[PDB]
Coordinates of C-alpha atoms in Angstrom, one line a residue:
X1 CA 12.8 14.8 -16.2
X2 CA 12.3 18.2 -15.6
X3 CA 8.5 17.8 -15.3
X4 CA 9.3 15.2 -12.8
X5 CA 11.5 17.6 -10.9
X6 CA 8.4 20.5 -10.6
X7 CA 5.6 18.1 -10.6
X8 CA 7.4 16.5 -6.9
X9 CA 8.3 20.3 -5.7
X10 CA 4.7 21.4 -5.9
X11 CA 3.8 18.0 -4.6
X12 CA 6.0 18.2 -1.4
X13 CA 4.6 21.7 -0.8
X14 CA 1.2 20.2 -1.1
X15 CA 1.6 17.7 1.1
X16 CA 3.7 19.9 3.9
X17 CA 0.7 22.7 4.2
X18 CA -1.8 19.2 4.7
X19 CA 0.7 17.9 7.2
X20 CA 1.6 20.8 9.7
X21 CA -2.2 21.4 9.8
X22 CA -4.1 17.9 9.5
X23 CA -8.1 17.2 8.5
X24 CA -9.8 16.5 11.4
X25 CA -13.6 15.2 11.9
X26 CA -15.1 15.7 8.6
X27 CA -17.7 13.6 9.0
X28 CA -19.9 11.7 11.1
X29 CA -20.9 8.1 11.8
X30 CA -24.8 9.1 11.0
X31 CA -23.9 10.4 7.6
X32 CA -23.6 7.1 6.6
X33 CA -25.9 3.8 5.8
X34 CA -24.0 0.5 6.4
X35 CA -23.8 -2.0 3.3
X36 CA -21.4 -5.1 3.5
X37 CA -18.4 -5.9 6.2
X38 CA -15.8 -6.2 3.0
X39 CA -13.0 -7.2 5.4
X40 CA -11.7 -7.9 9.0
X41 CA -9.0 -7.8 11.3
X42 CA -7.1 -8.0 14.8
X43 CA -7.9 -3.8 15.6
X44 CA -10.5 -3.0 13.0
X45 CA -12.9 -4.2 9.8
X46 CA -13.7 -2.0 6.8
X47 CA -17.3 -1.9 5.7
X48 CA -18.3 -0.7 2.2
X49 CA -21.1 2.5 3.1
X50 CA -23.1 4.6 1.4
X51 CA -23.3 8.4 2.2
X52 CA -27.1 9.0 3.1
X53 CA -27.6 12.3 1.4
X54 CA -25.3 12.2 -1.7
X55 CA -25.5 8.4 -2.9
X56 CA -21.9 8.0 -3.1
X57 CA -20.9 4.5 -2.0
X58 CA -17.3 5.0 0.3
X59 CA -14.9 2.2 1.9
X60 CA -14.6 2.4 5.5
X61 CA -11.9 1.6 7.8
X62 CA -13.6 1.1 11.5
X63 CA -10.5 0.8 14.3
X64 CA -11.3 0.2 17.8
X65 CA -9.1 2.3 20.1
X66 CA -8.9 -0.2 22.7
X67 CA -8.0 -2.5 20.4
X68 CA -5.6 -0.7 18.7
X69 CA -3.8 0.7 22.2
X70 CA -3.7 -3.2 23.1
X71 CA -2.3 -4.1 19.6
X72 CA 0.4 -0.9 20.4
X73 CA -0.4 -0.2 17.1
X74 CA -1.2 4.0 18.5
X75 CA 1.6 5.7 17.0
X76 CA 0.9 3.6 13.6
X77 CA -2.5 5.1 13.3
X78 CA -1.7 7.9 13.9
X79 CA 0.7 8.0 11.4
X80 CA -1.3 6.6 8.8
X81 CA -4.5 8.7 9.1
X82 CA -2.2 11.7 9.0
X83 CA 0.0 10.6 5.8
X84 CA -3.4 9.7 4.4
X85 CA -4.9 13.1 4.5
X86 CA -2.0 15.0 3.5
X87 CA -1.1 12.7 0.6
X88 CA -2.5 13.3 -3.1
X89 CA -1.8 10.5 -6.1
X90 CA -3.6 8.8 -8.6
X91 CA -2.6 5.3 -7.4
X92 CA -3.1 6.0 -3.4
X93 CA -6.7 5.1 -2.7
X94 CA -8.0 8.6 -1.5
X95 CA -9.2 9.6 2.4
X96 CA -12.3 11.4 1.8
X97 CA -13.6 12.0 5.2
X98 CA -12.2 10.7 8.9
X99 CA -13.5 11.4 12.4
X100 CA -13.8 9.5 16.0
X101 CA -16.3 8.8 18.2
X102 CA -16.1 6.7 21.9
X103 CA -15.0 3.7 21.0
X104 CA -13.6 3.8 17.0
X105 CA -11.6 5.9 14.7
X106 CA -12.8 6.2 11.3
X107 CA -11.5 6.6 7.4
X108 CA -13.6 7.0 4.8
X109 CA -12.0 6.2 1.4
X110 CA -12.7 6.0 -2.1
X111 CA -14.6 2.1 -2.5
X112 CA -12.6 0.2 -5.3
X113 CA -14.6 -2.6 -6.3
X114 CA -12.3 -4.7 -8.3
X115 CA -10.9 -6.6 -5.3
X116 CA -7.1 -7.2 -3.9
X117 CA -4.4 -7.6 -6.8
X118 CA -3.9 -11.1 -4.7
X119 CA -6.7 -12.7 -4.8
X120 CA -6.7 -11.8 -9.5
X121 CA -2.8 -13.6 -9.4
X122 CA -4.3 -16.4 -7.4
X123 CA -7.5 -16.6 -10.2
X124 CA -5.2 -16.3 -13.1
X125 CA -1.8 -18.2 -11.9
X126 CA 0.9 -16.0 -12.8
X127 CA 0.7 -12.8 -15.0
X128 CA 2.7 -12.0 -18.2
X129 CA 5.7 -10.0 -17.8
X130 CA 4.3 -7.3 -20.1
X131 CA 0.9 -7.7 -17.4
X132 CA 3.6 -7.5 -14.4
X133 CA 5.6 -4.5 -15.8
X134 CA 2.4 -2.7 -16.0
X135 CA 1.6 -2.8 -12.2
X136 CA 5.0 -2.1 -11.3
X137 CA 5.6 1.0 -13.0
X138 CA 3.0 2.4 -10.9
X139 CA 4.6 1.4 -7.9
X140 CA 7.7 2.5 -9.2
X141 CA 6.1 6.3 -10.0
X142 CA 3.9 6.2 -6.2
X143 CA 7.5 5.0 -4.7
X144 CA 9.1 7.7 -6.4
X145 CA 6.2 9.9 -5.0
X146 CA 6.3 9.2 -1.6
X147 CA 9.9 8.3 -1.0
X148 CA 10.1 12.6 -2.2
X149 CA 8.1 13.5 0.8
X150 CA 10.0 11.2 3.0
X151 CA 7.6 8.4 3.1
X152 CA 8.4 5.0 3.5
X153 CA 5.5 3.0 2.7
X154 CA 6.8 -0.6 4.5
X155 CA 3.2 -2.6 4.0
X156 CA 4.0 -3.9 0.1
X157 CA 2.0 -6.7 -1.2
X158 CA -0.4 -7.9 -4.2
X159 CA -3.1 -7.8 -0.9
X160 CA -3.1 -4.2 -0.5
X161 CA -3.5 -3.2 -4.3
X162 CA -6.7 -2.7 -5.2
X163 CA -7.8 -2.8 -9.0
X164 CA -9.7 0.2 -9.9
X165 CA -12.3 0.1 -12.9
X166 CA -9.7 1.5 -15.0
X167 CA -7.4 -1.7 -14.2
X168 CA -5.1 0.6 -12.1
X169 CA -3.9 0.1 -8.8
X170 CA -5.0 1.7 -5.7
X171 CA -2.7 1.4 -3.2
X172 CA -4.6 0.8 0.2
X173 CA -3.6 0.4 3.5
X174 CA -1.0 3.3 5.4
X175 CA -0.6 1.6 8.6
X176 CA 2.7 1.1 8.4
X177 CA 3.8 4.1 6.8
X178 CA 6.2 6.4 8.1
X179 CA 7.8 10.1 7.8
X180 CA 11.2 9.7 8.7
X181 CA 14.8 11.3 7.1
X182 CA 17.1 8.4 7.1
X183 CA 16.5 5.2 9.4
X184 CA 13.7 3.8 11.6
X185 CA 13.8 0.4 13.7
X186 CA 10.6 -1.3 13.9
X187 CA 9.7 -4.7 12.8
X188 CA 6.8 -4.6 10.4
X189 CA 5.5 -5.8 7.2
X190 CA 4.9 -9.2 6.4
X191 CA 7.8 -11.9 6.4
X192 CA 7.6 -13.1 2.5
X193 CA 8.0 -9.0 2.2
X194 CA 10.8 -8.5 5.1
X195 CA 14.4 -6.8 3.2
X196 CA 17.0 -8.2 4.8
X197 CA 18.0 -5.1 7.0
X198 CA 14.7 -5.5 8.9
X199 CA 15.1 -9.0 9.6
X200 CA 18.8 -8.4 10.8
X201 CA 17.4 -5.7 13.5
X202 CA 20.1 -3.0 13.2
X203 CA 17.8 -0.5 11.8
X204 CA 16.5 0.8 7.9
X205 CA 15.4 3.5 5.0
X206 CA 13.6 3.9 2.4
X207 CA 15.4 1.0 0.3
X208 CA 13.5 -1.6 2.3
X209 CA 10.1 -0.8 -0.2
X210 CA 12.7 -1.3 -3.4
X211 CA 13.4 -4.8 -2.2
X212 CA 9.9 -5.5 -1.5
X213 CA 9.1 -4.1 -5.2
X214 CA 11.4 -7.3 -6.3
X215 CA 9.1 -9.4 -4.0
X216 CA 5.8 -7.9 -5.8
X217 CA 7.4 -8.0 -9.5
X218 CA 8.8 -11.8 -8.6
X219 CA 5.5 -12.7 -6.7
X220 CA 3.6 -11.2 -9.9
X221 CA 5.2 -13.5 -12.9
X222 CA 6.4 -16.3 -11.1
X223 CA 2.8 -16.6 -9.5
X224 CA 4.5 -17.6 -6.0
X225 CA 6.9 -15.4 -3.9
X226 CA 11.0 -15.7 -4.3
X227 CA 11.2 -16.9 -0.7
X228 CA 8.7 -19.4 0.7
X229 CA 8.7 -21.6 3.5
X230 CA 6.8 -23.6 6.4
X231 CA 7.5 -21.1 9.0
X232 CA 8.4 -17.6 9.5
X233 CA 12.2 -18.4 10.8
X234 CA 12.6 -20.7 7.5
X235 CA 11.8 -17.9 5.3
X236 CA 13.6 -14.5 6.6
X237 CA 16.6 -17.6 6.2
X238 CA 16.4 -17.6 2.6
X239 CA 15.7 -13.8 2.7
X240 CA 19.6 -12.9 4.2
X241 CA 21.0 -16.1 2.6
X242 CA 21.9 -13.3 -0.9
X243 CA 20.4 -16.3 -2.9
X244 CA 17.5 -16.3 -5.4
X245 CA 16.0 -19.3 -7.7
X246 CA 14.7 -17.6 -11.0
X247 CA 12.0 -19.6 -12.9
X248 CA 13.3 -20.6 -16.7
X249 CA 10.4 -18.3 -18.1
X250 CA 11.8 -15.3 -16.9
X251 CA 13.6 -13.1 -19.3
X252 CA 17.5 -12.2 -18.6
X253 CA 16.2 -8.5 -18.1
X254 CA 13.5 -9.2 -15.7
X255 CA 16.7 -11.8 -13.6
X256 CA 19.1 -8.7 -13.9
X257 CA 16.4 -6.1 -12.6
X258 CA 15.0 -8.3 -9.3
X259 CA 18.8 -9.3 -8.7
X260 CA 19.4 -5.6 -8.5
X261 CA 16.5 -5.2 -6.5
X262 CA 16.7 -8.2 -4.2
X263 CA 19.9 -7.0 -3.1
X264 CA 21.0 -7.8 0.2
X265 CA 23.3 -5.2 1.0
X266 CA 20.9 -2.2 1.1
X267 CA 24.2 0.0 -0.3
X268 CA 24.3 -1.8 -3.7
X269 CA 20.4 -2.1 -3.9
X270 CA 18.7 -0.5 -6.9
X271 CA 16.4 2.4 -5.9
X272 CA 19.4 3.3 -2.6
X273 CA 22.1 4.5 -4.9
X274 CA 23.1 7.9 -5.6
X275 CA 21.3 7.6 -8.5
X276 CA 18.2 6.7 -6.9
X277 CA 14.5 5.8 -8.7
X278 CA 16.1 6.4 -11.9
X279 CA 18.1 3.1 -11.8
X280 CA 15.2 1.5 -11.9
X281 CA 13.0 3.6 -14.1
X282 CA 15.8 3.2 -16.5
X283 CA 16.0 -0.3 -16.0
X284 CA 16.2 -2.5 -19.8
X285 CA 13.4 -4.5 -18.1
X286 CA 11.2 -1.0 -18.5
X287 CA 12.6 0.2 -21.6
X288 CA 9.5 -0.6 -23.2
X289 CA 7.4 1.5 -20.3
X290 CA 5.9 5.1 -21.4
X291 CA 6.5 6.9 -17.6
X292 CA 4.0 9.7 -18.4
X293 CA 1.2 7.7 -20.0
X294 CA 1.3 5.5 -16.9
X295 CA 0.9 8.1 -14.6
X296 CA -2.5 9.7 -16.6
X297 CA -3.4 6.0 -16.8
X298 CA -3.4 6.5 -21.0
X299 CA -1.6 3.0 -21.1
X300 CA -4.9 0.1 -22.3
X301 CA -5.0 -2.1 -18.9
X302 CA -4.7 -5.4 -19.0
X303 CA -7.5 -6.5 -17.5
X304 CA -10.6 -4.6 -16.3
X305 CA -12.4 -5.8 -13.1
X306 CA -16.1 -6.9 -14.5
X307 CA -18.3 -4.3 -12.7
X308 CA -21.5 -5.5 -11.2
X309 CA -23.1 -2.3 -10.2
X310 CA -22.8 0.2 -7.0
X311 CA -22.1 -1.9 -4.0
X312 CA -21.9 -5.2 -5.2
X313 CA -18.7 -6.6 -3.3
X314 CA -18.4 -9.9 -5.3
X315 CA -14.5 -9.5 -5.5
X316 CA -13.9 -9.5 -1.9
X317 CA -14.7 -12.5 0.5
X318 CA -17.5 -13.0 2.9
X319 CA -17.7 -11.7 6.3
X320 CA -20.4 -12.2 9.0
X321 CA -21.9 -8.8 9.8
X322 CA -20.9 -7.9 13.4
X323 CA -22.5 -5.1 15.4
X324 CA -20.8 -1.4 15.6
X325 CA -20.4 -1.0 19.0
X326 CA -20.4 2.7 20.5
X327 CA -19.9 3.0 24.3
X328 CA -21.5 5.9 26.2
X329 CA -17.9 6.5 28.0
X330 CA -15.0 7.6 25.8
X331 CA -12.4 5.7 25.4
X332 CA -8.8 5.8 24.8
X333 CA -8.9 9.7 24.6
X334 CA -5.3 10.8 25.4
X335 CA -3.7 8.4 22.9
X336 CA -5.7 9.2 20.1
X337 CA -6.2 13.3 20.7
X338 CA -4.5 14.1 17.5
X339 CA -6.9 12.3 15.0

């Protein structure tokens, strides 16, 4: 515990230096040869790349600025490029390099070839709850992490964790974090994700990624999310409803640790009490879990993506490839000053 205690102090200090005085344009758009579109979206795609001079194959996040102003997603990139280059732990995927130019914003990250946690569950069905406990424990230790620096992390799901070659996580995607000392307002995340206190609109904290952590653990053994439906409206029901249907497989530790985390009211929820990350950590359900050895990654993974070689992409879907467009006019340059 003490180790704990000094290992987050040295951390914070760390991360506070990086964050008063951010990384900015470390790289540049020529410094890189194009490979695959690995994934799109409404403000952006990421492209797997290879750095021209050194080799090194990198995963990069392209956001167009209009895009992203149209979106009113500013203030959320923003956020995330700066939380991304100040932060430093084994299972964040790391921000190696960022810059703009005209049109785009860029983030150059460590490439992690094993593919989305999502589309593994969907491939296997459901995983063991020894295979589960694994993969949350590190969520539990980068929670832990992040919620010491004031970091709310909001964008939980098997989707954004990547499997690394090691068959850890690598926890991608910082959109939607925050820095922010008690309670924020806005309506983000993904509805099979959504705590309660989101839904009901009067404002959250930090307890909002515990309850999503008894989403990803449920999601994870049951092989389906605790609250499913047709349409949006149908399922943040059956989120506030305080009522959860348990499969008969699950053990009576697992049931008591998701009904402490899929707690409604956010002042009895495990992870927002007094006693914090330890209620968890201490859990029966993780009595079995060796803390330390998971966070060196000494604990055998159970499963180890199949690697195909440098830039193969094989674990991630198809994508046409779609021209990077740079406009001789800059755009957007007000808004996006601080990147």
């Amino acid at each position: 515990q003490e180790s704990v205690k000094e290992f987050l102090a040295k951390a914070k200090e760390d991360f506070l230096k990086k964050w008063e005085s951010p990384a900015q344009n470390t790289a540049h758009l020529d410094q890189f040869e194009r490979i695959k579109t690995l994934g799109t979206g409404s403000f952006g795609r990421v492209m797997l790349v290879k750095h021209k001079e050194t080799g090194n194959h990198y995963a990069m996040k392209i956001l167009d600025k209009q895009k992203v102003v149209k979106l009113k997603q500013i203030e959320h990139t923003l956020n995330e490029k700066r939380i991304l280059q100040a932060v430093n732990f084994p299972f964040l995927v790391k921000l190696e390099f960022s810059f703009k130019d005209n049109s785009n914003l860029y983030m150059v990250m460590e490439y992690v070839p094993g593919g989305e946690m999502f589309s593994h569950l969907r491939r296997i069905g459901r995983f063991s709850e020894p295979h589960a406990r694994f993969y949350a424990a590190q969520i539990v230790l980068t929670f832990e992490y992040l919620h010491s620096l004031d970091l709310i992390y909001r964008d939980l799901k098997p989707e954004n964790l990547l499997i690394d070659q090691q068959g850890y996580i690598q926890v991608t995607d910082f959109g939607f974090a925050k820095r922010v000392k008690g309670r924020t307002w806005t309506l983000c995340g993904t509805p099979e994700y959504l705590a309660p206190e989101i839904i009901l609109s009067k404002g959250y904290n930090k307890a909002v990624d515990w309850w999503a952590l008894g989403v990803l653990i449920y999601e994870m053994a049951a092989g389906y999310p605790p609250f499913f439906a047709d349409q949006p409206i149908q399922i943040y029901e059956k989120i506030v409803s305080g009522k959860v249907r348990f499969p008969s497989h699950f053990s009576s530790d697992l049931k008591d640790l998701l009904r402490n985390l899929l707690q409604v009211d956010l002042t009895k929820r495990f992870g927002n009490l007094k006693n914090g990350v330890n209620d968890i950590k201490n859990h029966k359900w993780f009595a079995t879990t060796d803390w330390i050895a998971i966070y060196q990654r000494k604990v055998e993974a159970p499963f180890i993506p199949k690697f195909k070689g440098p830039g193969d992409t094989s674990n991630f879907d198809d994508y046409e490839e779609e021209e990077i467009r740079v406009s001789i006019n800059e755009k957007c340059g007000k808004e996006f000053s601080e990147f």
